[PDB]
Design a protein around this ligand. Structure first.
Ligand SMILES: [Mg+2]
Ligand SMILES: [Zn+2]
Lengths: 717, 23, 687, 81, 62, 224, 226
DNA sequence: CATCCGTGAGTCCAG
């Protein structure tokens, strides 16, 4: 739903209302009915309420970066002249309320309304088509409000007390209807750990097996729990049939719940359940006691003690440079390191000095909003500011904003503050440009078939083999495997197949292969499957927005483009590296790769690096020429020790990156072929969005890259 | 006081004494 | 918009323009804050968008020398001793010398306290230097800022980003029916208002011989008399209400240079950009979520955030080929009910009430003698009504506008008034609007804390203090520590102590925290005004102390504690809020971004001449743009028909949009879209 | 098992999707029927041989889309691509 | 040539396309949007576009 | 575990009065006095000016010759006028004064059944040669009624509609002394604080509140 | 327009719909009506108990499945109506194998048990059970520490749920009367014991509050319109 | 592998 202004609606449904004005005979013809609307006669406000009945409208907010930039709503009339918006779609639109204006378009045709209600309605688009994570989820006050009541407080009043002496066990209530009356009188805290008998909530899976034998929990069956009253109220929203959760609601906790509701439970349950969460948050956010004063914001106690230790350490480096024993490149390189450490120790000074009661920490540690780096800037210190060049300034801002920055501190801070804003405005232009390029190249890419039926797929590292034994979950699991579909039966050591082919990978199914011991699965991909036009359905797999197999007809290429371009504002490799790969430029680094695998022959000179390679299988030696400014990349050797930098006598695979930098994809092609260059690009691209905390599923990248290799040159006519 | 020049309302000021020159 | 808005504009320094640089030519070096900007050009005052860094305000104390460079005052130090002798130094003339910061501690004679003091040097480099090498020192702490920037209390507690907006938004403040001076000030409010020239300042000393709302007459000493006429309810450049009112009562003794009458946003000769409201720092029922704002209905019921806006509407009568347009009260096929507010001429009568669509000036024009419809001929035979050859071209009221007609101006070529070639009668109608504050109206403070009005609760719904006083504005906690602008919090603290009044404990001597406090502030009355100059003013130790000295109310009870907080009661449920909430006063400005202006929509309307698409803007009553980025979002969803609908039958399908209207009013089905006329144009452009 | 769907959330979309191949398919499925019903009212006044009227009880001033979407839920319509 | 034209270097595309006498098959997203056709995606494809809805035989006028 | 009917005590002050009510249920006092507070501030009847008319004046935005204030600032001063009318139907007051000197609420003449409770209220400062002739209209009502509603009815181009604040209630609060002592001595004591505009008594205000509330709570007792 | 009263039903509980209230009287009515039902209605429950084979709490009763804790709780759920204000005492004795219920209870004259099928404790063979209950009257909810002084040869303090009302919530939406979309709509959820109907519990809760606002009205009975 | 010319360098709004 959304609050459409009565004034806006009248002109929007203008020919629709005139219709029902000559209908019920308020006006004699089509001409007069128009006058009635223009005069805003009292009759029409009863007519309009009828017209807009279940007739969806559209809300657009520029810049429209991803498709969720436009979401359809059920129109609700409202007094005032402003458009009333739901708090949960603030993430999708990226719409704060400091004076945003939203566009409104009225779908007309019978098809148009059908499209809007079904495809584009806010309640059906809860997930991010880019990642699959919930966008329509608790975000600011809502998360802070929920995080409140689900927090377990030790000594709080009304707490459970064991029996000892002449007084019985304090803290046990027969039912949730009892403890509610207890906090009303003022005996029980809503955050205090107690013991209660519940009759309308399914117990934990681990406990349900203990108290029923999984006989099937039923509404009416009672059970005892050790939670807080607030955690009970929370689980009534999930609601029934969902295993009770006994933690404090950090954003990551709540995110998990919704993402689990997204997988199993139907859309209209999630839609209504998430509605229940929002109302819960705001009510308690008001009664959370989160308030900013001069007191709560506290400067550290060892403020000047720590800063004097690192200023004394800094005067030793300035005197060691005064004697000219340190290089001018090393002085600043040493100075930056001293102060970076200083800022950290000031940060530690806050966390232990600040109560968990403290609101400023409460908001930050709970995933509500704001970083601790802000809180450090607020109470601790500003630290290093950026130079015009970009390098960090040798001089530090020791003051916090609570203490009042000096005249000269404010000046150098502002400079960096403005250059930050300037760069921000320029990357957006770049990103939005990069966006439109990815769109054009991937327009013909549509889901056309249900299955290509080719067995070609690509291998994905499920988990690394831990040195001591057992395994470690791979860092790239989420974005590379979790949404893929299997193109080959996954077998462990035994002949037993854990997961078939043509099976979508889900969370428990990755847990089926992770415990089985198998660390590599072959998965269907955009690259491999080959269809006449566009791509097939099966390879693409599970649509990140639906949590199910992609429908036939989705313009996945555009969504891919949008998925990549949407968060492209938050970069520092950086965004230039993003263009360098999709545009396939001969890189800046130009890191050399081995043309043939064999034993390495390092022969460094102080003036120049030279690398010679003795072919493993007979062959003639192939030798390269490298600049001393670049350095050898610590590649994972046969010794399974990646930190081993390139040494002579080492053994490299074919196409192995010799030095640090960026390999030339065109050389990767001629050396390692059309398929390997696809996996290089995709993961080189990924590494950039990784470092800045952006998770795009590999699926979207591959769509674009596929459209890079659809052509082969003509050697002989 | 801050600006006792024109005949203005007295706006008391936290300050170190500022007498270099008026704006 | 306001007097401050005007003043700053005149103190603008733009790099753009003929002989200067273009926007695209300007790299990143030009825009950032240069070291030499100290005391000359403000490092904070600059626009936010694509014009950042290329537009700056001139600093307060700087002046322009006969060659076109920017000088700035410095105090001269002969040999460690500060001298009152002042010399202006240009940018490069300052680089050869060595300057001390203004706040460096000085002996009562003029000597420095410590040998090594804070020093400014060429290339923005800073180091400690013995007192023997000090040449000059800064005039004032607030020397590097501009005029608007110097009106931001506790500026040294806010990050440059938000403080940049706070300054830029002050010029956006709307004049209110009557304006109150802020409880918390900086001292700049005075000198800013006077130099603005939209207040009234006496030229020569004397006595008020006579006073009216119309004008003030001053009887000088030498016997001569000067009379200042009051600007009363005049339309500005930006539809704001420039209204002036007398300060002095009849018979007052006034000396020269004294503000005898203030104008918009001015209280007793001080910049009055907003009101002093009772603030509460807490999330409340989600209505303040993401920087929105909650209001108390008192502010509507007492016109606290109400402003006046004048619009100037025009229409002329020209010589045509079919005759000439004549303004008359006789308009074809109009009832006398609609013409009831017109004079015998056809003009609206002064003081009348107009609504959107009504008639302001009745003008008719002779229409081209084209063969009238054979179907309308027939219709004119049955009812026997002979058609007139005059078509209605009257000035009606634009959509959105509404108010009272506060003045008519009429020029006629007949009465020898000089008009351009072709015009006979030209009428102007001034209509004002008394807009009370409503939902969606942009409210902001001096600290870059902006926000539109979320919800205005009934006065009883407002969380309130122990003595029953309901707050005015409910700001959301979450949106404070992120922006680093906790100056808004310090303002609230000092804002409460200024409202409550205080008294430092003199028994057992003067307290050590209030040791640096000037004598005049140890004792303050309720509703007292105070200054907190930038890079000076109150410190955190004193502000904490003052919260302890908080004088009790009428009932003898203190309301807030030393933490600055207090206990509230939820007016809805009744139960007291469980935790102490920070309460005080904050100066809030009404910006010029009101829903009455910003709201706009359209079903059908005018269209472009070539592309046949809808026109653009509210002023043209045009449709929104569904551009390239919006089209991707549609294409992404897989909403083929919606997207097709928007660009065809909703845009420039000449026969289509027409055949969509009918289908709707006939209650039928929407037909299949045709060919976009825009495409045909492209094809004829290629040919 | 859920709470009673209010307004435009009814009929619930999950049960609506159980009878159709995909999200997009349901759109043309319903709209073309919503088109048929609106033809029926307009035609009936002057033209016989209209498409068959709504197979369920019409809500008071119910939208033809809202009508069609309900009978889809009632499995009273046949599906062809 | 249409999709290419409305992308970049507009004048370069046209000079080549005119000499090459390239005939554009209007079967793409950028293509169809410009001419105002239903985009060949989602609800636009013939699989979903050509659908016949009829009442069940069991369903009958009362 | 005790039964006692409640009381309604009173400790006074000329303008404001404290009402003491006890003994009430434990944890009840806060939501009881608030139910009263929200009744006083919003729905207590009174009388106030709705429209006015000034000689030589045709709208709100101009100046009367020889008068120090503008019509807006004058109409703004009249918002603090305290009036109590008994006539359920509109009545017309008057004010005519000339020459030098100050005009106040005292120079207003209420007809039969209308009374001014604050004659010392400054209105306009008429200097020499100045004349002011006003014609004030007072109505009965409750709460707050915006001026804008009068204009459309049919009012002539002379009348200038003015906002109305009917509520004669100034400031309301309450405090509670809950004896939370571990015994059957747990009760809540209520101390209501009511301040008026000298248009009505603080007591008379609490009475109308109760009268309203009683007739509202009576529908929960009626049977189906 | 005058206000109405609606009802949406279930056996033990129901929802009441009040609209349209004058703008801002939804929250003026809400919390005030809830605390009344919860605290201002008299009933009867259990004040204190006494067990035969108990000298301290941690040990369960010899021959009983449930802990001393789980029995107190089940007894808290016992709905009882007493005719006399003065505290009465009922005995419950049972031995051997089986299950003890609320129908096995021996109630005094003028004292009734309303749910005789309530599970309380499961006894095994050679399992003896002798318990003394103390039944009082009152309103609302009273803590256990306030009832710490039964015979000190095993007196146990129990939470006293006198109130025949179990749990009440309320929501305030806005209905659109005339042109005004300001009027308030009050929705009230009320769940009671098996002693009194929710429909009845509200009328007495209604009548009670009428008594309170009478004190103010008595002075002058000035004006109002319905 | 480095130069010279031509073509790019986010959206909506207001005005
Ligand atoms: Mg925004
Ligand atoms: Zn395939």
């Amino acid at each position: 739903q959304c609050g459409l202004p009565k004034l806006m609606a009248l002109e929007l449904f203008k020919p629709f209302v005139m219709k029902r004005l000559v209908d019920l005979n308020h006006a004699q013809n089509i001409k007069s009915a128009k006058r009635m609307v223009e005069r805003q006669r009292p009759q029409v406000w009863d007519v309009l309420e009828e017209v807009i009945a279940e007739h969806p409208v559209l809300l657009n907010r520029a810049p429209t970066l991803h498709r969720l930039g436009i979401q359809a709503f059920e129109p609700m009339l409202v007094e005032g002249k402003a458009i009333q918006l739901h708090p949960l779609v603030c993430e999708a639109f990226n719409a704060d309320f400091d004076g945003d204006q939203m566009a409104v378009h009225l779908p007309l045709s019978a098809e148009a309304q059908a499209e809007a209600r079904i495809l584009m309605l806010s309640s059906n688009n809860i997930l991010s088509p880019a990642s699959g994570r919930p966008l329509a989820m608790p975000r600011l006050d809502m998360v802070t409000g929920l995080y409140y009541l689900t927090t377990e407080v030790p000594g709080d009043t009304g707490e459970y007390q064991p029996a000892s002496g002449d007084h019985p066990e304090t803290g046990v209530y027969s039912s949730p209807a009892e403890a509610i009356m207890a906090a009303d009188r003022g005996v029980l805290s809503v955050r205090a750990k107690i013991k209660v008998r519940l009759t309308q909530l399914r117990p934990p899976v681990e406990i349900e097996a203990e108290l029923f034998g999984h006989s099937g929990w039923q509404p009416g069956d009672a059970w005892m729990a050790e939670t807080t009253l607030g955690r009970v109220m929370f689980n009534e929203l999930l609601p029934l049939g969902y295993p009770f959760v006994n933690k404090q609601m950090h954003k990551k906790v709540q995110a998990a719940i919704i993402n689990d509701l997204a997988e199993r439970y139907p859309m209209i349950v999630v839609a209504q359940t998430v509605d229940k969460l929002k109302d819960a948050g705001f009510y308690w956010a008001t009664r959370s006691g989160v308030t900013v004063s001069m007191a709560d914001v506290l400067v550290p106690p060892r403020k000047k003690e720590i800063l004097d230790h690192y200023e004394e350490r800094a005067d030793k480096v300035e005197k060691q440079f005064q004697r000219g024993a340190l290089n001018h490149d090393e002085r600043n390189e040493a100075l930056v390191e001293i102060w970076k450490e200083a800022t950290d120790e000031v940060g530690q000074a806050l966390r232990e000095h600040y109560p968990d009661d403290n609101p400023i920490i409460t908001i930050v540690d709970s995933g509500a909003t704001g970083n601790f780096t802000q809180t450090r800037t607020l109470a601790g210190m500003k630290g290093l500011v950026t130079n015009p060049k970009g390098e960090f300034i040798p001089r530090p801002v020791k003051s916090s904003f609570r203490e009042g920055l000096t005249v000269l501190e404010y000046f150098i801070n502002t400079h960096g503050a403005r250059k930050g804003l300037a760069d921000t405005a320029l990357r957006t232009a770049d990103s939005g440009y990069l966006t439109r390029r990815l769109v054009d190249v991937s327009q013909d890419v549509i889901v056309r078939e249900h299955d290509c039926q080719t067995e070609r797929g690509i291998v994905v590292e499920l988990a690394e083999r831990a040195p001591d034994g057992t395994l470690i979950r791979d860092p790239y699991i989420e974005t590379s495997a979790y949404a893929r579909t299997l193109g080959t039966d996954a077998v462990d050591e035994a002949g037993n197949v854990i997961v078939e082919r043509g099976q979508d990978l889900g969370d428990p199914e990755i847990d089926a292969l992770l415990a089985a011991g198998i660390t590599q699965v072959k998965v269907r991909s955009v690259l491999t499957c080959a269809t006449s036009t566009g791509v097939c359905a099966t390879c693409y797999g599970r649509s990140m927005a639906t949590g199910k197999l992609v429908d036939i007809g989705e313009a996945v290429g555009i969504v891919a483009a949008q998925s990549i371009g949407e968060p492209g504002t938050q970069l520092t490799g950086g965004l230039p590296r993003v263009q360098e790969l999709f545009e396939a430029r001969v890189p800046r680094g130009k890191a050399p790769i081995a043309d043939v695998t064999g034993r390495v022959r390092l022969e460094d000179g102080e003036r120049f690096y030279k690398i010679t390679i003795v072919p493993d299988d007979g062959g003639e030696e192939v030798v390269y020429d490298k600049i001393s400014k670049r350095q050898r990349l610590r590649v994972f050797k046969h010794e399974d020790g990646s930190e081993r930098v390139l040494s002579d006598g080492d053994h490299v695979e074919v196409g192995q990156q010799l030095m640090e930098g960026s390999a030339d994809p065109h050389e990767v092609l001629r050396v390692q072929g059309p398929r390997e260059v696809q996996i290089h690009l995709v993961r080189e691209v990924q590494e950039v969005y990784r470092a800045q905390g952006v998770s795009i599923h590999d699926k979207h990248i591959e769509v674009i890259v596929r459209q890079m290799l659809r052509r082969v040159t003509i050697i002989d006519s | 006081s801050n600006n006792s020049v024109p005949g203005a309302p007295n706006r008391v000021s936290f300050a170190k004494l500022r007498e270099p020159l008026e704006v | 918009n306001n007097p401050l808005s005007g003043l700053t504009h005149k103190r603008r320094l733009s790099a753009l323009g003929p002989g200067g640089l273009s926007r695209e030519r300007a790299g990143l070096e030009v825009r950032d804050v240069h070291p030499s900007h100290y005391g000359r050009m403000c490092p904070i005052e600059t626009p936010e968008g694509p014009n950042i860094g290329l537009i700056g305000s001139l600093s307060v104390y700087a002046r322009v020398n006969p060659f076109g460079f920017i000088e700035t005052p410095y105090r001269k130090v002969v040999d460690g001793v500060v001298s009152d002798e002042i010399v202006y130094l240009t940018a490069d003339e300052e680089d050869r010398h060595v300057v001390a910061q203004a706040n460096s501690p000085i002996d009562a004679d003029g000597r420095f306290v410590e040998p090594r003091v804070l020093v400014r040097r060429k290339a923005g480099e800073v180091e400690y230097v013995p007192s023997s090498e000090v040449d000059y020192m800064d005039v004032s702490p607030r020397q590097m800022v501009s005029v608007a920037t110097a009106m931001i209390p506790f500026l040294e507690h806010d990050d440059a980003n938000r403080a940049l907006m706070g300054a830029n938004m002050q010029r956006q403040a709307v004049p209110l029916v009557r304006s109150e001076a802020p409880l918390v000030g900086t001292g700049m409010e005075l000198r800013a208002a006077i130099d603005a020239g939209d207040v009234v300042v006496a030229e020569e000393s004397g006595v008020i011989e006579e006073v009216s709302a119309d004008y003030i007459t001053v009887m000088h000493d030498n016997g001569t008399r000067r009379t200042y006429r009051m600007r009363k309810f005049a339309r500005s450049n930006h539809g704001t209400c420039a209204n002036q009112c007398p300060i002095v009562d009849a018979g007052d003794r006034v000396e020269a240079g004294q503000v005898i009458a203030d104008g918009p946003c001015t209280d007793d000769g001080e910049m009055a950009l907003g009101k002093n409201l009772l603030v509460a720092i807490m999330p409340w029922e989600g209505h303040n979520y993401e920087d929105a704002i909650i209001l108390s209905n008192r502010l509507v019921e007492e016109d606290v955030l109400t402003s006046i806006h004048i619009e100037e509407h025009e229409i002329d009568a020209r010589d045509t080929k079919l005759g000439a347009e004549e303004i008359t009260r006789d308009i074809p096929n109009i009832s006398d009910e609609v013409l009831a507010d017109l004079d015998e001429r056809g003009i609206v009568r002064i003081g009348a009430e107009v609504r959107d669509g009504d008639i302001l000036v009745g003008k008719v024009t002779p229409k081209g003698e084209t063969e009238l419809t054979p179907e309308e001929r027939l219709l004119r035979a049955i009812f026997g009504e002979k058609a007139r050859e005059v078509r209605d071209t009257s000035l009606k009221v634009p959509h959105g506008e509404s108010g009272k007609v506060i003045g008519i101006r009429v020029f006629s070529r007949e009465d020898e008034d000089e008009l351009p070639a072709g015009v006979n009668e030209l009428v102007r109608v001034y209509v004002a609007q008394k807009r009370k504050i409503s939902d969606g109206d942009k409210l902001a403070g001096r600290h870059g804390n902006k926000g539109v009005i979320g919800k205005i609760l009934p006065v009883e719904d407002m969380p309130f203090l122990a003595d029953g006083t309901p707050v005015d504005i409910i700001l959301n906690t979450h949106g404070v520590p992120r922006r680093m602008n906790i100056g808004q919090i310090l303002e609230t603290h000092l804002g409460w102590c200024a409202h409550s009044g205080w008294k430092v404990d003199a028994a057992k001597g003067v307290p050590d925290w209030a040791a640096r406090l000037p004598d005049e502030l140890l004792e303050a009355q309720p509703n007292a005004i105070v200054s907190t100059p930038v890079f000076d003013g109150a410190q955190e130790a004193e502000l904490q102390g003052l919260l302890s000295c908080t004088l009790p109310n009428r009932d003898g009870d203190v309301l807030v504690d030393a933490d600055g907080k207090a206990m509230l009661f939820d007016g809805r449920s009744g139960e007291p809020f469980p935790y102490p909430v920070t309460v005080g006063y904050m100066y809030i400005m009404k910006l010029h971004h009101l829903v009455d202006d910003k709201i706009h929509a359209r079903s059908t309307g005018p269209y472009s001449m070539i592309t046949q698409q809808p026109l653009g803007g509210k002023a043209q009553f045009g449709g929104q743009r569904f551009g390239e980025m919006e089209c991707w979002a549609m294409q992404a969803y897989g909403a083929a028909y919606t997207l097709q609908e928007l660009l065809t039958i909703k845009s420039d399908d000449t026969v289509g949009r027409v055949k969509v209207y009918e289908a709707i009013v006939k209650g039928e089905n929407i037909p299949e879209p045709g060919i976009p006329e825009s495409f045909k144009v492209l094809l004829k452009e290629l040919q | 098992g859920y709470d009673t769907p209010l307004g435009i959330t009814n009929p619930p979309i999950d049960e609506l999707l159980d009878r159709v191949s995909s999200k997009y398919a349901l759109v043309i499925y319903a709209a073309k029927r919503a088109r048929q019903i609106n033809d029926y009212y307009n035609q009936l006044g002057e033209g016989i041989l209209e498409y068959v009227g709504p197979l369920v009880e019409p809500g008071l001033q119910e939208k033809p889309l809202s009508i069609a979407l309900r009978e889809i839920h009632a499995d009273l319509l046949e599906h062809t691509e | 040539w249409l999709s290419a034209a409305s992308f970049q270097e507009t004048t370069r595309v046209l000079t080549d396309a005119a000499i090459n006498c390239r005939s554009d098959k209007l079967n793409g997203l950028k293509e169809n949007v410009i001419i105002g056709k239903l985009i060949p995606a989602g609800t636009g494809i013939n699989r979903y576009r050509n659908i016949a809805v009829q009442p069940t035989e069991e369903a009958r006028a009362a | 575990i005790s039964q006692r009917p409640t009381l309604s005590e009173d400790v006074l002050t000329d303008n404001r009065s404290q009402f003491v009510i006890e003994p009430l249920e434990p944890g009840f006092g806060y939501t009881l006095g608030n139910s009263l507070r929200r009744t006083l501030l919003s729905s207590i009847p009174g009388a106030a000016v709705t429209s006015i008319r000034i000689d030589g004046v045709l709208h709100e935005f101009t100046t009367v010759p020889g008068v120090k204030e503008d019509v807006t600032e004058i109409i703004l001063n009249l918002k603090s006028l305290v009036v109590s009318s008994e006539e359920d139907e509109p009545v017309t007051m008057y004010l005519r004064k000339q020459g030098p000197g100050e005009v106040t609420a005292g120079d207003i003449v209420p007809p039969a059944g209308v009374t001014v409770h604050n004659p010392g209220m400054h209105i306009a400062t008429l200097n020499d040669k100045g004349k002011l002739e006003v014609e004030l209209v007072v109505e009965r009502g409750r709460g707050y009624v915006p001026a804008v509603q009068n204009r459309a009815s049919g009012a002539e181009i002379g009348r200038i509609p003015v906002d109305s604040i009917y509520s004669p209630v100034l400031k309301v609060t309450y405090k509670v002394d809950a004896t939370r002592v571990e015994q059957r001595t747990d009760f809540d004591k209520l101390i209501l604080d009511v301040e008026t505009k000298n248009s009505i008594s603080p007591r008379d205000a609490l009475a109308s509140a109760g009268k309203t509330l009683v007739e509202l709570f009576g529908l929960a007792r009626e049977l189906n």
